Structure formats: structure tokens, C-alpha cells
Amino acid sequence: VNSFSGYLKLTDNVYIKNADIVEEAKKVKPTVVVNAANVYLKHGGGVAGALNKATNNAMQVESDDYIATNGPLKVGGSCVLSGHNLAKHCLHVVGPNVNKGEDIQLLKSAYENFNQHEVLLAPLLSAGIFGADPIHSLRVCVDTVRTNVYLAVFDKNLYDKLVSSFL
Numbered sequence: 001v002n003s004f005s006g007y008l009k010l011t012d013n014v015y016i017k018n019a020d021i022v023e024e025a026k027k028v029k030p031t032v033v034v035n036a037a038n039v040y041l042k043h044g045g046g047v048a049g050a051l052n053k054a055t056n057n058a059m060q061v062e063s064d065d066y067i068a069t070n071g072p073l074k075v076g077g078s079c080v081l082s083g084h085n086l087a088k089h090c091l092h093v094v095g096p097n098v099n100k101g102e103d104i105q106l107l108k109s110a111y112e113n114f115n116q117h118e119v120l121l122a123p124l125l126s127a128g129i130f131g132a133d134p135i136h137s138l139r140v141c142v143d144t145v146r147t148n149v150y151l152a153v154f155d156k157n158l159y160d161k162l163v164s165s166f167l
């Protein structure tokens, strides 16, 4: 048993809810929250900007030190950093950004990072301002992630479309 509440079960391991991932993280304090990161860990907008704002910019300060030491992530890659006030850990995962012309085939590689963690609170990778079709992102998630993933979908309209179109 875990602390996640109000989710619809899609598969053996994937669950979904209409929720603001920031408010969900604050309530649950999951072991792992996933950030929709870019390779520079510049948390300006979308999910990343919202998570970072909720940490009072401490996520950005930590991220800047990580990049100064290690250089940028790969598209499809990830790093584990602090979860600050939101979670034990934040898994920063870089899905391809369609609005930058990145290969959508990298979305599967991005979701493979989730398999290193038994349970995660996550957004749909490459959705929102990353430009991919969220229906596609949910299909890749279900067909790639084998660990237990709790998906938070901010937009109620999109949530209802994801559920009602799910195969």
C-alpha cells in the first residue's frame, strides 16, 4: 500500500489523476517526483518552472551547480537531485522537445529512466510546452515503464481525453 489517492488505474503499474503535480508532491512527499527537465536544467516554465518556484528557486541553485560540474544532460537522459520540500528525490528527465526539432523516438529512452525507481510521481514526458501529443506520451509510458508510476495531468480537459481514448 502507498499514500497516493484518487488515481484511476490504467494498467498493472500505471495510474493517472487530474492534479497539479506541485500540490500532489506537497501532499504525498513521494520518494521520487519526476521533473520535465531540459538538458541545461533551466527550470523556466511548464512543469519545471512550477516545481522550481515551489522550492523557492533552491532546485535551480542545485541544478546550476550540477551543470557547472557535469555539463548538460542528454536528450532521453536523467539525473537524480534533491526533492527539496516536494519529495525525497527529484528525477530530472529530458524528453525530446518537438518545438526544438528533437527525435520523438527518444521519448521511449526518456521513460526508461523511470524503471530505476520502484515508485514515482510524474508528468507525461514531452507533453505541454515540449510539443508532443500527450496521447502518444501516455502510450509510450504504459509500454515502457514497468515500475509503479502515478501520473499527474494538470489540464482537466486533457485528463478526460487521455482516459476516454486509452486502449
Ligand SMILES: Nc1nc2[nH]c(=O)cnc2c(=O)[nH]1
Pocket: 019, 020, 021, 022, 046, 047, 050, 123, 128, 152, 153, 154
Ligand atoms: N501535472 C502537471 N502539473 C503542472 N503544474 C503546473 O503548475 C504547471 N504545469 C504542470 C504540468 O504540466 N503538469
